[PDB]
């Protein structure tokens, strides 16, 4: 909320693509759209439970 | 690969836990032997884990087995203690049977045959140590090195060094060593020692230890003070 | 600063001069040629109306006709004829109908998947050649077999045969790798794709040799060109799923690289640099020579290479005020050049509490410590002691 | 992965099983051994409690392994219980065939064998206990060791075991005294067990001590466990309560 | 109050963008006529853990997935009960639809 980011939550999910529809190709994905709504802070939660 | 298990042989023809037993090693403090015609010299690194570490009762590094033989170690600290315990009875018995004290290439086979039992079982790991194992013999007077490795494999070196970047130490020795003059006076020979251990311990002059094994049963640990000039000839020539 | 404004004085001047030009010549490219160009663009548009339905073409049969598939979905015998040829026509291209009469009235259209976006880099990196200082001996072995035959093809014809193939980049970690593949691919300027081997293995069960398929088909249009394969290491024991991913792909992806880099496909003229740390875990027929040559092995930086790389990073900073520079260097024994990239960070994080702007030679001593301290474990002289 | 058995090394040359036994030491309660040349102070905090625990009747972190060597335990107290018998017995057993009390050294190398014995041969489980040996034997005086469960041995001025091991040794060497006194001593122990223990107040309860002393009275050795009032009063000689 | 009511093969695709279309009417009713409460009787179909999205038909539940979350946000704190709603694995749910 300081720096104003939007803070956009990422774990790995197939909810977050609908398109290719998984998180391995959706690596690619993140930079861009994280690029278009600048500055961002990006929380990959490495549960390590998750699935 | 096939670290499952000791027994098991392997693709390769390497039984993985000497492999790793070898990597142990390299965890323990520095530890250098150097002959020279009259004179061993037994250094070893005895590094300093925090400043309330005594130095009234804290274990040196190098321990005498018996009486004109001289080891040090490197590895795994606890595993050591039995070897080097088991060592020594074994040493003294010696001259239980024979009335003769303990002789350097009777002992290398020994410290070499406890090691080598392990690791034929299946039901025992090997030692993580490997030893330097440095002396005369009691009939003669020429200097001898010997080494254990956790194999059950020893050898003979002129000059040798084991655990902590290893490697390092042992180039510097190549290029420094001559071995059609091997230094014939003791206090040249403890020079290239401690020249050695300065770069492990990268700086200290109190954590550097150097220890001396002289023929007819003198063994001798220098003095604190003793190293210190020695070190002073080393930087001021460099 | 007054050397700053040499660089600054040509820069602004120049391009922006150009703009002014090109902006006014947009109407004037135009003007000498209205009446062949205008011509064709009448002929063109009268043809073809309006709208253009774009179809995806099939293929096409060599006698002047093909078969389409539209988006639309009606499948259409067209004609190739008209502002079209047989050469620009080749599968997976997608083709320009004119909706009325399909007649294929031209092609200008062959890439909009969002599947080559990922593979091209749009990249900017901030350390370019001559920041790779120092191992320079070893730097010369990745140029003779990338920089060099792209660039002199003459050295290539005058010893004969083939340039090499390829290469491995391996060692420890911290050995300025990475740095290498993005730097020799500035110096030539040829298509930098870069892909990771943990985006090698997929979260869906054989798709994963389909994305190997299309690297080379990528890096074979837009050739001369050099393939990253970064972290080609994770392909060993690191995988997404085991029920939809599984062990199958895992040696499947691996296949699949036999036959772009060597197989009858063969693919020339495509040089791929592979990273990894461990040659030991990778494949003893990707290690094969003749699709990657010779390897070229990297080693915790020396002793007098670790100078060259604390002045890459201390050229940046604001320096050491009583100097203890060349000592830093001596202290460190068989160290990696990310040590240095962490001491330089790890001094300006022990000033970034102070929020001093400044940086002095007595935080460079503090830092390294601090950094040490963070390598080595509590069981490590525990195990040990 | 590596995780199993003793006989088998990780590529590292870790055995995990060393490793994970360290861990269970911060587990246990804090236990803190600070060397004096008036003395040593042996001083003990409990795992956990509750109001109607009782633990005023007896230690159960504090040992006698004889009558000049005396030794704190942290970590499982089962494990522990099969050692300090084994000591014990060998401690007599030297009273026996050399008419002297042990020394601190012959005792903490025999314990440091066995430890490591367990963890070399066959399939029995390493030990996970860290006994700080504090000893008198008449060749080096006064005397602190600690073991390591990996069945080592390092000689000490201070020395901290059990749960939180780092903080409690950082508080400890930050106001040590090369000399010190036997009473500054005891003091330094319940400053430290106080920021380290996440118990609201510090009771008598949850504390034992011990005190092995030659000056208090000469020519004899004594043993002094502080009984319960004796901790109680401590604490409000330093203000704690 | 009020009881309505649907199961998630009621959301059944049997024509494109039919099934979208049943998220938006059972919340909208219920929002006009509060209080109100919504059944979703199972949500098994809705509620798979993982998707694929690499085919047509996958993306039209996962599109029913999406909005059904962002309807539940907007519902609150109004004097409606919150869907109730039922399954019948633990691990049917998203980590998306249990927030
Ligand atoms: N010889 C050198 N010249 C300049 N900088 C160097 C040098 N070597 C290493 N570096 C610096 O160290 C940084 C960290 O190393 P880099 O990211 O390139 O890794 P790497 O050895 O490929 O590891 P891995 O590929 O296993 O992750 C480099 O980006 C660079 O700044
Ligand atoms: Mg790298």
Same mark, same amino acid.
């Given at each position: 909320?300081?720096?104003?980011?939007?803070?956009?939550?990422?774990?790995?999910?197939?909810?977050?693509?609908?398109?290719?529809?998984?998180?391995?190709?959706?690596?690619?994905?993140?930079?861009?759209?994280?690029?278009?709504?600048?500055?961002?802070?990006?929380?990959?939660?490495?549960?390590?439970?998750?699935? | 690969?096939?670290?499952?298990?000791?027994?098991?042989?392997?693709?390769?023809?390497?039984?993985?836990?000497?492999?790793?037993?070898?990597?142990?090693?390299?965890?323990?403090?520095?530890?250098?032997?150097?002959?020279?015609?009259?004179?061993?010299?037994?250094?070893?690194?005895?590094?300093?884990?925090?400043?309330?570490?005594?130095?009234?009762?804290?274990?040196?590094?190098?321990?005498?087995?018996?009486?004109?033989?001289?080891?040090?170690?490197?590895?795994?600290?606890?595993?050591?203690?039995?070897?080097?315990?088991?060592?020594?009875?074994?040493?003294?018995?010696?001259?239980?049977?024979?009335?003769?004290?303990?002789?350097?290439?009777?002992?290398?086979?020994?410290?070499?045959?406890?090691?080598?039992?392990?690791?034929?079982?299946?039901?025992?790991?090997?030692?993580?140590?490997?030893?330097?194992?440095?002396?005369?013999?009691?009939?003669?007077?020429?200097?001898?090195?010997?080494?254990?490795?956790?194999?059950?494999?020893?050898?003979?070196?002129?000059?040798?060094?084991?655990?902590?970047?290893?490697?390092?130490?042992?180039?510097?020795?190549?290029?420094?060593?001559?071995?059609?003059?091997?230094?014939?006076?003791?206090?040249?020979?403890?020079?290239?020692?401690?020249?050695?251990?300065?770069?492990?311990?990268?700086?200290?002059?109190?954590?550097?230890?150097?220890?001396?094994?002289?023929?007819?049963?003198?063994?001798?640990?220098?003095?604190?003070?003793?190293?210190?000039?020695?070190?002073?000839?080393?930087?001021?020539?460099? | 600063?007054?050397?700053?404004?040499?660089?600054?004085?040509?820069?602004?001047?120049?391009?922006?001069?150009?703009?002014?030009?090109?902006?006014?010549?947009?109407?004037?490219?135009?003007?000498?040629?209205?009446?062949?160009?205008?011509?064709?663009?009448?002929?063109?548009?009268?043809?073809?109306?309006?709208?253009?339905?774009?179809?995806?073409?099939?293929?096409?049969?060599?006698?002047?006709?093909?078969?389409?598939?539209?988006?639309?979905?009606?499948?259409?015998?067209?004609?190739?004829?008209?502002?079209?040829?047989?050469?620009?026509?080749?599968?997976?291209?997608?083709?320009?109908?004119?909706?009325?009469?399909?007649?294929?009235?031209?092609?200008?259209?062959?890439?909009?998947?969002?599947?080559?976006?990922?593979?091209?880099?749009?990249?900017?990196?901030?350390?370019?050649?001559?920041?790779?200082?120092?191992?320079?001996?070893?730097?010369?072995?990745?140029?003779?077999?990338?920089?060099?035959?792209?660039?002199?093809?003459?050295?290539?014809?005058?010893?004969?045969?083939?340039?090499?193939?390829?290469?491995?980049?391996?060692?420890?970690?911290?050995?300025?790798?990475?740095?290498?593949?993005?730097?020799?691919?500035?110096?030539?300027?040829?298509?930098?794709?870069?892909?990771?081997?943990?985006?090698?293995?997929?979260?869906?069960?054989?798709?994963?040799?389909?994305?190997?398929?299309?690297?080379?088909?990528?890096?074979?249009?837009?050739?001369?060109?050099?393939?990253?394969?970064?972290?080609?290491?994770?392909?060993?024991?690191?995988?997404?799923?085991?029920?939809?991913?599984?062990?199958?792909?895992?040696?499947?992806?691996?296949?699949?690289?036999?036959?772009?880099?060597?197989?009858?496909?063969?693919?020339?003229?495509?040089?791929?640099?592979?990273?990894?740390?461990?040659?030991?875990?990778?494949?003893?027929?990707?290690?094969?020579?003749?699709?990657?040559?010779?390897?070229?092995?990297?080693?915790?930086?020396?002793?007098?290479?670790?100078?060259?790389?604390?002045?890459?990073?201390?050229?940046?900073?604001?320096?050491?005020?009583?100097?203890?520079?060349?000592?830093?260097?001596?202290?460190?024994?068989?160290?990696?050049?990310?040590?240095?990239?962490?001491?330089?960070?790890?001094?300006?994080?022990?000033?970034?509490?102070?929020?001093?702007?400044?940086?002095?030679?007595?935080?460079?001593?503090?830092?390294?410590?601090?950094?040490?301290?963070?390598?080595?474990?509590?069981?490590?002289?525990?195990?040990?002691? | 992965?590596?995780?199993?058995?003793?006989?088998?090394?990780?590529?590292?040359?870790?055995?995990?099983?060393?490793?994970?036994?360290?861990?269970?030491?911060?587990?246990?309660?804090?236990?803190?051994?600070?060397?004096?040349?008036?003395?040593?102070?042996?001083?003990?905090?409990?795992?956990?409690?509750?109001?109607?625990?009782?633990?005023?009747?007896?230690?159960?972190?504090?040992?006698?392994?004889?009558?000049?060597?005396?030794?704190?335990?942290?970590?499982?107290?089962?494990?522990?219980?099969?050692?300090?018998?084994?000591?014990?017995?060998?401690?007599?057993?030297?009273?026996?065939?050399?008419?002297?009390?042990?020394?601190?050294?012959?005792?903490?190398?025999?314990?440091?064998?066995?430890?490591?014995?367990?963890?070399?041969?066959?399939?029995?489980?390493?030990?996970?206990?860290?006994?700080?040996?504090?000893?008198?034997?008449?060749? !080096?005086?006064?005397?602190?060791?600690?073991?390591?469960?990996?069945?080592?041995?390092?000689?000490?001025?201070?020395?901290?075991?059990?749960?939180?091991?780092?903080?409690?040794?950082?508080?400890?060497?930050?106001?040590?005294?090369?000399?010190?006194?036997?009473?500054?001593?005891?003091?330094?122990?319940?400053?430290?067990?106080?920021?380290?223990?996440?118990?609201?107040?510090?009771?008598?309860?949850?504390?034992?001590?011990?005190?092995?002393?030659?000056?208090?009275?000469?020519?004899?050795? !004594?043993?002094?466990?502080?009984?319960?009032?004796?901790?109680?009063?401590?604490?409000?000689?330093?203000?704690?309560? | 109050?009020?009881?309505?009511?649907?199961?998630?093969?009621?959301?059944?695709?049997?024509?494109?963008?039919?099934?979208?279309?049943?998220?938006?009417?059972?919340?909208?009713?219920?929002?006009?006529?509060?209080?109100?409460?919504?059944?979703?009787?199972?949500?098994?179909?809705?509620?798979?853990?993982?998707?694929?999205?690499?085919?047509?038909?996958?993306?039209?539940?996962?599109?029913?997935?999406?909005?059904?979350?962002?309807?539940?946000?907007?519902?609150?704190?109004?004097?409606?009960?919150?869907?109730?709603?039922?399954?019948?694995?633990?691990?049917?749910?998203?980590?998306?639809?249990?927030?």
């Amino acid at each position: 909320h300081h720096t104003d980011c939007k803070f956009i939550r990422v774990s790995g999910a197939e909810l977050v693509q609908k398109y290719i529809g998984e998180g391995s190709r959706m690596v690619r994905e993140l930079f861009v759209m994280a690029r278009e709504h600048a500055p961002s802070i990006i929380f990959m939660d490495e549960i390590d439970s998750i699935g | 690969g096939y670290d499952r298990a000791l027994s098991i042989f392997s693709p390769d023809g390497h039984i993985f836990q000497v492999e790793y037993a070898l990597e142990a090693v390299k965890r323990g403090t520095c530890a250098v032997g150097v002959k020279g015609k009259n004179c061993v010299v037994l250094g070893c690194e005895r590094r300093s884990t925090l400043k309330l570490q005594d130095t009234r009762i804290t274990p040196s590094k190098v321990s005498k087995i018996d009486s004109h033989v001289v080891l040090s170690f490197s590895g795994l600290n606890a595993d050591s203690r039995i070897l080097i315990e088991k060592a020594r009875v074994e040493a003294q018995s010696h001259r239980l049977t024979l009335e003769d004290p303990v002789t350097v290439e009777y002992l290398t086979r020994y410290v070499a045959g406890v090691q080598q039992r392990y690791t034929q079982s299946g039901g025992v790991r090997p030692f993580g140590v490997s030893t330097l194992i440095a002396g005369f013999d009691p009939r003669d007077d020429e200097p001898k090195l010997y080494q254990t490795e956790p194999s059950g494999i020893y050898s003979s070196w002129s000059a040798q060094t084991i655990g902590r970047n290893s490697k390092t130490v042992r180039e510097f020795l190549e290029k420094n060593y001559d071995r059609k003059e091997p230094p014939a006076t003791v206090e040249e020979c403890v020079k290239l020692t401690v020249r050695s251990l300065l770069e492990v311990v990268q700086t200290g002059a109190k954590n550097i230890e150097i220890t001396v094994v002289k023929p007819d049963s003198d063994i001798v640990a220098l003095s604190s003070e003793e190293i210190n000039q020695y070190v002073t000839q080393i930087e001021q020539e460099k | 600063t007054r050397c700053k404004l040499k660089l600054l004085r040509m820069e602004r001047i120049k391009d922006h001069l150009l703009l002014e030009e090109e902006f006014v010549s947009n109407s004037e490219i135009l003007k000498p040629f209205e009446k062949k160009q205008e011509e064709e663009k009448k002929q063109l548009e009268e043809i073809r109306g309006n709208p253009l339905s774009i179809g995806t073409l099939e293929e096409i049969i060599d006698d002047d006709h093909a078969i389409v598939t539209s988006p639309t979905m009606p499948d259409y015998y067209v004609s190739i004829l008209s502002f079209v040829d047989k050469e620009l026509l080749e599968p997976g291209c997608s083709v320009l109908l004119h909706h009325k009469t399909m007649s294929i009235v031209g092609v200008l259209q062959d890439d909009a998947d969002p599947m080559v976006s990922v593979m091209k880099m749009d990249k900017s990196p901030t350390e370019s050649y001559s920041d790779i200082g120092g191992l320079e001996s070893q730097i010369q072995e990745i140029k003779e077999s990338v920089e060099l035959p792209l660039t002199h093809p003459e050295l290539y014809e005058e010893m004969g045969i083939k340039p090499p193939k390829g290469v491995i980049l391996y060692g420890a970690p911290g050995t300025g790798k990475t740095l290498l593949a993005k730097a020799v691919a500035n110096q030539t300027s040829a298509t930098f794709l870069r892909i990771v081997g943990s985006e090698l293995i997929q979260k869906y069960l054989g798709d994963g040799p389909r994305l190997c398929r299309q690297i080379f088909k990528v890096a074979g249009e837009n050739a001369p060109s050099i393939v990253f394969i970064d972290e080609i290491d994770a392909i060993g024991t690191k995988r997404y799923d085991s029920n939809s991913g599984g062990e199958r792909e895992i040696q499947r992806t691996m296949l699949e690289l036999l036959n772009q880099l060597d197989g009858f496909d063969d693919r020339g003229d495509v040089k791929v640099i592979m990273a990894t740390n461990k040659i030991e875990t990778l494949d003893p027929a990707l290690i094969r020579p003749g699709r990657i040559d010779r390897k070229i092995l990297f080693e915790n930086p020396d002793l007098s290479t670790k100078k060259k790389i604390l002045g890459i990073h201390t050229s940046k900073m604001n320096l050491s005020e009583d100097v203890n520079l060349e000592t830093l260097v001596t202290t460190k024994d068989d160290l990696s050049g990310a040590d240095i990239q962490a001491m330089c960070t790890e001094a300006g994080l022990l000033a970034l509490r102070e929020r001093r702007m400044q940086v002095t030679a007595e935080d460079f001593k503090q830092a390294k410590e601090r950094v040490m301290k963070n390598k080595v474990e509590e069981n490590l002289e525990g195990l040990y002691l | 992965r590596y995780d199993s058995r003793t006989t088998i090394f990780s590529p590292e040359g870790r055995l995990y099983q060393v490793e994970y036994a360290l861990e269970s030491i911060s587990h246990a309660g804090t236990a803190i051994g600070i060397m004096a040349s008036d003395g040593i102070v042996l001083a003990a905090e409990r795992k956990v409690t509750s109001t109607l625990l009782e633990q005023d009747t007896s230690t159960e972190k504090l040992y006698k392994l004889n009558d000049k060597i005396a030794v704190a335990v942290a970590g499982l107290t089962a494990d522990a219980e099969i050692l300090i018998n084994t000591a014990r017995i060998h401690a007599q057993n030297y009273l026996k065939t050399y008419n002297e009390d042990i020394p601190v050294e012959i005792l903490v190398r025999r314990l440091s064998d066995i430890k490591q014995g367990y963890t070399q041969h066959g399939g029995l489980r390493p030990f996970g206990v860290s006994f700080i040996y504090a000893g008198y034997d008449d060749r !080096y005086g006064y005397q602190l060791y600690t073991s390591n469960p990996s069945g080592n041995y390092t000689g000490w001025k201070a020395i901290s075991v059990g749960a939180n091991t780092s903080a409690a040794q950082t508080l400890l060497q930050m106001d040590y005294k090369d000399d010190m006194k036997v009473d500054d001593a005891i003091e330094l122990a319940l400053k430290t067990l106080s920021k380290t223990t996440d118990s609201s107040a510090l009771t008598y309860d949850r504390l034992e001590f011990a005190t092995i002393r030659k000056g208090a009275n000469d020519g004899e050795v !004594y043993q002094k466990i502080f009984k319960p009032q004796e901790i109680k009063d401590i604490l409000v000689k330093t203000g704690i309560t | 109050a009020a009881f309505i009511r649907v199961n998630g093969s009621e959301f059944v695709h049997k024509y494109l963008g039919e099934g979208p279309r049943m998220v938006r009417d059972v919340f909208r009713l219920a929002r006009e006529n509060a209080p109100s409460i919504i059944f979703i009787d199972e949500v098994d179909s809705i509620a798979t853990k993982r998707f694929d999205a690499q085919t047509g038909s996958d993306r039209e539940v996962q599109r029913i997935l999406i909005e059904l979350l962002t309807q539940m946000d907007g519902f609150d704190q109004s004097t409606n009960v919150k869907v109730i709603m039922a399954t019948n694995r633990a691990d049917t749910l998203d980590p998306a639809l249990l927030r």
